[PDB]
Amino acid sequence: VPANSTSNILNRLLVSYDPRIRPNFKGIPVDVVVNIFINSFGSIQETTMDYRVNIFLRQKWNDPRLKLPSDFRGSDALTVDPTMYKCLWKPDLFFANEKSANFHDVTQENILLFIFRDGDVLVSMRLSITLSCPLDLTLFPMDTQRCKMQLESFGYTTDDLRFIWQSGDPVQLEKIALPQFDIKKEDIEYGNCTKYYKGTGYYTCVEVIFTLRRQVGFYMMGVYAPTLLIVVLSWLSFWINPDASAARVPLGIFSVLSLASECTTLAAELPKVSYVKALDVWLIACLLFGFASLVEYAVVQVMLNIPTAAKRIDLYARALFPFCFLFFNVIYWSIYL
Amino acid sequence: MSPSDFLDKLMGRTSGYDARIRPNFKGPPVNVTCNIFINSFGSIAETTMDYRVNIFLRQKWNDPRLAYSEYPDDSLDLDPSMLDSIWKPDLFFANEKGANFHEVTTDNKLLRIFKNGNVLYSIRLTLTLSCPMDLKNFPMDVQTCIMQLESFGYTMNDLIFEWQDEAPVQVAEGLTLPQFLLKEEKDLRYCTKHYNTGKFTCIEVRFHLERQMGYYLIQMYIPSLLIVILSWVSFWINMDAAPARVALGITTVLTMTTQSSGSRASLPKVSYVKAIDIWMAVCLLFVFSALLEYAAVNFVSRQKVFIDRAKKIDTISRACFPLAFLIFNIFYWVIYKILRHE
Amino acid sequence: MSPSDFLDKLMGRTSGYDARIRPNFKGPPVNVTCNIFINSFGSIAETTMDYRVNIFLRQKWNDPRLAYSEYPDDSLDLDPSMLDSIWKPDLFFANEKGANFHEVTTDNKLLRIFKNGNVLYSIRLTLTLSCPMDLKNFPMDVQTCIMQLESFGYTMNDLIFEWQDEAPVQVAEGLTLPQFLLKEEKDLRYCTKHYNTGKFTCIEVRFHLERQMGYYLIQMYIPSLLIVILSWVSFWINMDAAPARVALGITTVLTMTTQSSGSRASLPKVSYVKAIDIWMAVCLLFVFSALLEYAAVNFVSRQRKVFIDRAKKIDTISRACFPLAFLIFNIFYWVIYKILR
Amino acid sequence: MSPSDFLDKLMGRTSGYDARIRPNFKGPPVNVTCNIFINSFGSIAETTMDYRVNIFLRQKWNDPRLAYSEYPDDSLDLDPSMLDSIWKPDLFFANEKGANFHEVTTDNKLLRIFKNGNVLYSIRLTLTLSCPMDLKNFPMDVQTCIMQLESFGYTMNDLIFEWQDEAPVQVAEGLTLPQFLLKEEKDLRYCTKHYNTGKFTCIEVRFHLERQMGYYLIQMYIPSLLIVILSWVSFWINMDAAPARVALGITTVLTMTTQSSGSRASLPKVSYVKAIDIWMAVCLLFVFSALLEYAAVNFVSRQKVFIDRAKKIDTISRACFPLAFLIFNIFYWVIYKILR
Amino acid sequence: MSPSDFLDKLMGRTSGYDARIRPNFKGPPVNVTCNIFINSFGSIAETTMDYRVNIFLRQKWNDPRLAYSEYPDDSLDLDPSMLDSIWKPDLFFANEKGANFHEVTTDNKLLRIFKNGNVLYSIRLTLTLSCPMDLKNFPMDVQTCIMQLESFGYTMNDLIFEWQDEAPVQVAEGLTLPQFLLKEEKDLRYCTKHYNTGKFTCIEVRFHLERQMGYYLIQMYIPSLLIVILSWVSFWINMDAAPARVALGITTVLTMTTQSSGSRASLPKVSYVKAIDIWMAVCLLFVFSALLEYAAVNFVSRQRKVFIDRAKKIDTISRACFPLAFLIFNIFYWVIYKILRHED
Ligand SMILES: *[C@@H]1O[C@H](CO)[C@@H](O)[C@H](O)[C@H]1NC(C)=O
Ligand SMILES: *[C@@H]1O[C@H](CO)[C@@H](O)[C@H](O)[C@H]1NC(C)=O
Numbered sequence A: 001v002p003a004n005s006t007s008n009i010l011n012r013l014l015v016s017y018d019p020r021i022r023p024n025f026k027g028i029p030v031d032v033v034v035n036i037f038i039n040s041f042g043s044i045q046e047t048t049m050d051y052r053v054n055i056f057l058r059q060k061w062n063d064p065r066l067k068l069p070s071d072f073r074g075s076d077a078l079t080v081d082p083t084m085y086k087c088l089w090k091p092d093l094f095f096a097n098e099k100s101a102n103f104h105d106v107t108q109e110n111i112l113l114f115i116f117r118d119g120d121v122l123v124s125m126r127l128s129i130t131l132s133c134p135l136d137l138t139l140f141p142m143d144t145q146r147c148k149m150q151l152e153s154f155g156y157t158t159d160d161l162r163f164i165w166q167s168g169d170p171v172q173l174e175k176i177a178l179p180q181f182d183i184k185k186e187d188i189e190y191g192n193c194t195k196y197y198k199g200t201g202y203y204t205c206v207e208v209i210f211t212l213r214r215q216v217g218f219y220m221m222g223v224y225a226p227t228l229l230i231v232v233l234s235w236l237s238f239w240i241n242p243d244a245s246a247a248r249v250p251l252g253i254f255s256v257l258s259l260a261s262e263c264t265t266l267a268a269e270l271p272k273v274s275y276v277k278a279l280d281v282w283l284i285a286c287l288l289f290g291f292a293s294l295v296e297y298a299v300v301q302v303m304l305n306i307p308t309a310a311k312r313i314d315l316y317a318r319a320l321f322p323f324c325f326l327f328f329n330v331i332y333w334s335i336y337l
Numbered sequence B: 001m002s003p004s005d006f007l008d009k010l011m012g013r014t015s016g017y018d019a020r021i022r023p024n025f026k027g028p029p030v031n032v033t034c035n036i037f038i039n040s041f042g043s044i045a046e047t048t049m050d051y052r053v054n055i056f057l058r059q060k061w062n063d064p065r066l067a068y069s070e071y072p073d074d075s076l077d078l079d080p081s082m083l084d085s086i087w088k089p090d091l092f093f094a095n096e097k098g099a100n101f102h103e104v105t106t107d108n109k110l111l112r113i114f115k116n117g118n119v120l121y122s123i124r125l126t127l128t129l130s131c132p133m134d135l136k137n138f139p140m141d142v143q144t145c146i147m148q149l150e151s152f153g154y155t156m157n158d159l160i161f162e163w164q165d166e167a168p169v170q171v172a173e174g175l176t177l178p179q180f181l182l183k184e185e186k187d188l189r190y191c192t193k194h195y196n197t198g199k200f201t202c203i204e205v206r207f208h209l210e211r212q213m214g215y216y217l218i219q220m221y222i223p224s225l226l227i228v229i230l231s232w233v234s235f236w237i238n239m240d241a242a243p244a245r246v247a248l249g250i251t252t253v254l255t256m257t258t259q260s261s262g263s264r265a266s267l268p269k270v271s272y273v274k275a276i277d278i279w280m281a282v283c284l285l286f287v288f289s290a291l292l293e294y295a296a297v298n299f300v301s302r303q304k305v306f307i308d309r310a311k312k313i314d315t316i317s318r319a320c321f322p323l324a325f326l327i328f329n330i331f332y333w334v335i336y337k338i339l340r341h342e
Numbered sequence C: 001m002s003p004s005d006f007l008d009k010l011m012g013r014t015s016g017y018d019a020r021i022r023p024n025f026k027g028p029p030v031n032v033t034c035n036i037f038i039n040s041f042g043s044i045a046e047t048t049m050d051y052r053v054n055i056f057l058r059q060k061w062n063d064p065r066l067a068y069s070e071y072p073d074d075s076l077d078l079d080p081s082m083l084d085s086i087w088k089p090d091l092f093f094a095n096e097k098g099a100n101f102h103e104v105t106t107d108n109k110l111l112r113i114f115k116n117g118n119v120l121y122s123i124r125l126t127l128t129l130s131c132p133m134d135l136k137n138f139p140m141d142v143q144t145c146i147m148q149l150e151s152f153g154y155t156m157n158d159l160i161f162e163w164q165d166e167a168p169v170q171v172a173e174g175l176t177l178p179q180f181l182l183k184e185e186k187d188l189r190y191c192t193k194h195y196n197t198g199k200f201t202c203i204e205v206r207f208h209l210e211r212q213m214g215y216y217l218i219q220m221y222i223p224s225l226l227i228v229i230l231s232w233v234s235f236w237i238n239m240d241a242a243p244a245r246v247a248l249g250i251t252t253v254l255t256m257t258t259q260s261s262g263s264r265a266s267l268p269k270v271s272y273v274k275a276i277d278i279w280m281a282v283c284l285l286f287v288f289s290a291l292l293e294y295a296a297v298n299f300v301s302r303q304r305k306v307f308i309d310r311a312k313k314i315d316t317i318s319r320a321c322f323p324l325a326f327l328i329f330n331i332f333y334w335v336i337y338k339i340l341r
Numbered sequence D: 001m002s003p004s005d006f007l008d009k010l011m012g013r014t015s016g017y018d019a020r021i022r023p024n025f026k027g028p029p030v031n032v033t034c035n036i037f038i039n040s041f042g043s044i045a046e047t048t049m050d051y052r053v054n055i056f057l058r059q060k061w062n063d064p065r066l067a068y069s070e071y072p073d074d075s076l077d078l079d080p081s082m083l084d085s086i087w088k089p090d091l092f093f094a095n096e097k098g099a100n101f102h103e104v105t106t107d108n109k110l111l112r113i114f115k116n117g118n119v120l121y122s123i124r125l126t127l128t129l130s131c132p133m134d135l136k137n138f139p140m141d142v143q144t145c146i147m148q149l150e151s152f153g154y155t156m157n158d159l160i161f162e163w164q165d166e167a168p169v170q171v172a173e174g175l176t177l178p179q180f181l182l183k184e185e186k187d188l189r190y191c192t193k194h195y196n197t198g199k200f201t202c203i204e205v206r207f208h209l210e211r212q213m214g215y216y217l218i219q220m221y222i223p224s225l226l227i228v229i230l231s232w233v234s235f236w237i238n239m240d241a242a243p244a245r246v247a248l249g250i251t252t253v254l255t256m257t258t259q260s261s262g263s264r265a266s267l268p269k270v271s272y273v274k275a276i277d278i279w280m281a282v283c284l285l286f287v288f289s290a291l292l293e294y295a296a297v298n299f300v301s302r303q304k305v306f307i308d309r310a311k312k313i314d315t316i317s318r319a320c321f322p323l324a325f326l327i328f329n330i331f332y333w334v335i336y337k338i339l340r
Numbered sequence E: 001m002s003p004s005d006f007l008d009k010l011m012g013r014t015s016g017y018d019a020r021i022r023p024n025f026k027g028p029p030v031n032v033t034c035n036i037f038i039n040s041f042g043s044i045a046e047t048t049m050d051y052r053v054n055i056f057l058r059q060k061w062n063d064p065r066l067a068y069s070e071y072p073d074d075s076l077d078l079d080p081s082m083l084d085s086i087w088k089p090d091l092f093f094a095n096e097k098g099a100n101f102h103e104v105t106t107d108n109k110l111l112r113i114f115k116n117g118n119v120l121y122s123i124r125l126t127l128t129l130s131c132p133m134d135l136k137n138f139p140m141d142v143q144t145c146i147m148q149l150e151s152f153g154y155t156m157n158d159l160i161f162e163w164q165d166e167a168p169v170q171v172a173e174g175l176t177l178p179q180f181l182l183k184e185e186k187d188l189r190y191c192t193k194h195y196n197t198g199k200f201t202c203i204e205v206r207f208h209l210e211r212q213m214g215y216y217l218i219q220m221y222i223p224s225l226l227i228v229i230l231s232w233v234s235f236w237i238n239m240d241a242a243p244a245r246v247a248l249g250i251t252t253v254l255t256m257t258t259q260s261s262g263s264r265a266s267l268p269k270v271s272y273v274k275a276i277d278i279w280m281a282v283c284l285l286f287v288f289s290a291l292l293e294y295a296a297v298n299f300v301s302r303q304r305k306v307f308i309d310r311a312k313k314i315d316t317i318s319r320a321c322f323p324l325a326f327l328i329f330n331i332f333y334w335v336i337y338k339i340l341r342h343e344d
């Protein structure tokens, strides 16, 4: 018999097979083993709070009416037509935290459908989902975001459809590196929710949690060094000859203005959130230090307009300010890792 | 008893059911008790006067020619793919700028049929709705954003919408908005708007939104106060070093005006005036007045007991500025935090 | 007797009605009366030279084959799914960068058949119509944007479009625009454009949009007025306080150039001069004139030899000419652009 | 006599007309005369090197299987929906980053069948074609953006494209562009490109575009000249104060650099040196020379009759710089307006 | 004899041919030879790390079920609409953020069937392929972007892909890029990646792009050189005009930190340090060290008197050392990054 004969016998519009009936109707619920392969990860945006992931979703279940006829033999798995993949019964599935998704279809539909002898059918399809993960920014430059995937069935109550993760390696990623992050391959927490909506029963939902650690190199080489250099410039201003206004005043004012502009530029790009973060705290502390230098010079000038007393105060401040800056830096770095 | 035969006899080809005709044709209008579950909420930007939501919209209605008695089970769940063979009520959102279904691995919808004929039909949507924004007091505004449900293909004589008696609109647990906070209480009204072609039914639910200002505090109010106080310190040093003080005045004025330009350019265009604009304008006026007073001091100092007069006016304004700034700040704060709204 | 039987007999498979053939074929042209209800209006962006609209387009015509007698009721709403099996007149908007339908939980379309044979067909659309803009006087311009309705596949001998006698285009109550006002009066004209393949019917509706100047006034004109008053006060200072006057001149210059940069970067590239550009250029020229007069006064005071008296006299004369010049320029500009232009 | 019967007998099921095979199969190649009507033009973004158009593309060909004689009328117009069962010649645009049809209340198509068998097929499209751009002289450039109509599914042995005899492409009355002038003259050429899969027909049209000088001139060309005039006036000072003179020098530098940076950032990347870059660089050099003159006057002011030498050098600079700018301005304008 | 009837007998209703069963079923895996013609190239954005192509992807394979002998002509250029009725090998690009067909006035396809059964299937595509892009030396980097053609629904035991022996990738004449240039040599590799569901075939082509540094040089390197030269010239002045020295140093620092901050705006936030970062940081540190030296010498001058001399000697030593140190650093960095590290 040709492959057409067996294919029609196992499923066809002519044969007694109805796609509109789930397996084991009026019986035990069908459990679906879900497996995810991440082809590409990244493009995580802080402003929109969402990331794009290319995932090869894989699911298999038990279909008694799909059992391979005894005529066929010699292959443990029989590949079938991705066009006919629409004909068979499907487990309805959707992503709860999904802004949008886009099916891939280039030169053909991107779906693979294996059928085994015992009746198991494996469906693997290529997806491009854009999940949103609410990310906390209490400590912004160094933080561990937890962006999550929530697979979930919709059209079937948990008494009919149930999702279970694969026993061995249910999420596989092949050496993917985000531009600014470091995904922990080993530390991928699992668990299932089975969210319950009032008046509509229980819907099963498996879940994946990713632990994304943000790299701090760009921000350390981006803002921290220029800010340190600005404060060192203010200290250099302090070392400049006092009771000579003309040199002193522009240095302090320009330091303060440069720091303010740096803070505005580095806070404009980040998403607007209510709570305070680490970057703005550091910037405002440095700005207050520059302000302190300016008011110290003002005190020196008003004391001058006795010279030993003004010089003594200037020397005391010039010795104290590096120390308090060092103490603030130590306590801030220790507190905020 | 065969499930395929039962489905065929219920609404299949051999059933005789027609999906092109509303239930109980030529009679009382079919009522729909729709309720909406919100899943996501955010991306609400005042720049283009819109916001986006993810809703689990569910509709219930009767259908006498669809009740069944063969299967003892009552809440018989059927697949979404069959939903094209059953009549559905027309429904769309009036204040909608654009929306689309969700089609991932299947079609996102659910249909259930009860013994008495009631039908539940929940179809997923993502609405980029629009509501007018009132920015009279922008940084501390309370905004009411609305969504509207109404039918198009049927008049009131054929289709009547209404909310659900208990828990009409719900919110997913732990929902967080990026910038605002959603007040728990939500208003429900009947728009029932009329056109020239008939009286189309309509249903409206109002969301009360309040904005947290702390981010605006940190990013906009503290820097302006710091710049103004820097101008204060600029004034503190005497007039002996005129060029340095005057150059610092120019640079502080330039930075303050660029801050004002950025503040006004970060927000869309509106004819009236907003609170942030008033605050920035008054603070710019304060720094301008400080520069003008320093210029007056220099004018008096430059050529008698004239230096005494210059010092006296300097001290007088150094004492007068704190009272003015404090009274303006406290008055603005109290009026825009209590008196103007709530 | 069954309603399904009636629907099938009217336009169904057994009806014999052919939707691919124009009504009154090989005879007088069909007569379509269309009126449009505007639902939303906004997103008027002059950078892309277009605007977005949201309309309830409604069309009515006559089909002699759709006359029915089984149901005594005349106004008979039908399922929108039958709209694909009934003749629908061609209608495309001539000037629209991109338009799309609206589908949510169904297709947003309404179809209705009356007893005599008249058909109603209301459909919801969103159009990104494009209207060229004239920005000769940008802050206080009056814009007229055009919506053109016309057919594509039918010659004037076959399909004729025309407005409705009463309430041709009706605006939704309470509609507001972020930065514009809509006048109640609207103009209706027939474009009836001629192509090389034949004469195609066309229908044109014009909206008179004017721009309120409140935001632009507050953002641009008031800061410049404050800057020039600051320059005035700088002028009032005698030349012996040279650093004060010179620094005040610098702050005037820099404020004016930043304002100019913002104004010129806020608008699309256009060859001709606009009112805001002329006004701000004159403000910059006045600031430059203040700098020039200060420099001339300082030069005169440099190399007492009865030169201080003449320098003071010329400073007073110029500081009394500056207010007259600025006031006359402002009043002239305002009157010409508010009445003459 | 019934129109439905005629439609069925011509394109319908009982007709036997197979729209799946080209006319004159195993015979001479059918020739197509296509003419394009331009409706909307603009949005020529130099950053991404593309422009968008709205064309009423029209095609004709002689199909012997569509001849009819029952209807006395010749130009028997047909409903656009019949186009699914009529042989539509393949045609795609070689250079287009993206194009789409247009549907509003219907599909924007037109079909017309004549007695002799000729068929007119008009369709409205929106195309964001891409044209590489040359910026060797940016503000005064004359550009040539291109459109290529060509077949994809038929060797030149089967399908041949050619323009119309007269009025091949006509622009709609009142057509305008935001910043360009579309001159009347348009060039038509035979493209006829080659591939390893055979010989493919290809039809090409070229649009000549030039950039209007009003906006760029009014926006920056006058202000830089006025700033340099201010510097020239500043060459008549006798060193009244040092920091004030320094600030007066720096302000012109700031205006200069803001204008130059804005104009340089308004453009995409080109490796060669352009007109506006040359102008900004020479303005930079001249204002820097003004600053150097300020520094030299400050230096020679300090300690011989050095005062007379300082005044002589100051008047030499004040008499040299304006003439140098005048000669540079006239030279640059003439070369990059006529000789380039 | 009717061509329509011949098409029906070949693949139509009366043919009996099925479009769902691959050729040579239950036999050797059918091999597919594919070649790619490039029509467009560009829009290489470093921020999102992707580039857009426009390719005429062609595929060939043998099929005994499509062998005809009635028509004497060897090649039958058939209508593109037939392609839904014949078997088509699945072929998706492994790395692409988004791809779509091109449909204008028709679907852009073609069908040409030879007598022996060979089938030469081509299609027009627009791919936004993503290629990972290192920037160890951002302005002088040689990038390798890749395209991975591979089957999805078929194991390598059924479908095998391989490049054409001659002329595997063709490039349209006159192709230019806004900021790069395509070298003539293109590598061809067999990825043949393994999954948990089998051993899938894969085909990879490597693009070598070298970046032209004209814009980076002109717009960024020259301003830095002018800035440091102006810093030297300002420092050459004596200590009498001390406020002028301080103001010039401050404005140099301000403009150069503005340049450095604006340098990184157009590039992705990368943890590692690139050439532009090194150059800007080193030159800004040079200006800062000049300011530090000026402050130290001023401290020396702050109480002829065996101090004015010292200060002048230190200033002259700095004037003789700073330009030489800057020049030696410049030559060392340029030669190392031109020859020793990368490129050339
Ligand atoms: C899913 O959660 C439900 C909660 O009732 C539990 O019974 C079930 O075991 C969970 N599934 C897995 C795979 O852990
Ligand atoms: C539906 O609800 C409306 C409104 O209360 C009521 O008038 C009507 O009788 C109800 N049922 C039917 C079958 O029309």
Ligand SMILES: *[C@@H]1O[C@H](CO)[C@@H](O)[C@H](O)[C@H]1NC(C)=O
Binding pocket: C028, C029, C030, C031, C032, C062, C160
């Ligand atoms: C529509 O207009 C035409 C042309 O004026 C007229 O002859 C005709 O009677 C009108 N009505 C119909 C139904 O054709």
Ligand SMILES: *[C@@H]1O[C@H](CO)[C@@H](O)[C@H](O)[C@H]1NC(C)=O
Binding pocket: D028, D029, D030, D031, D062, D160
């Ligand atoms: C069509 O034009 C071609 C090219 O000139 C010519 O060879 C051919 O004879 C023409 N007519 C037909 C019917 O093919």
Ligand SMILES: *[C@@H]1O[C@H](CO)[C@@H](O)[C@H](O)[C@H]1NC(C)=O
Binding pocket: E024, E028, E029, E030, E031, E062, E160
């Ligand atoms: C195709 O190539 C493969 C791999 O070399 C070979 O085994 C096979 O015989 C070839 N031909 C066919 C018809 O599969």
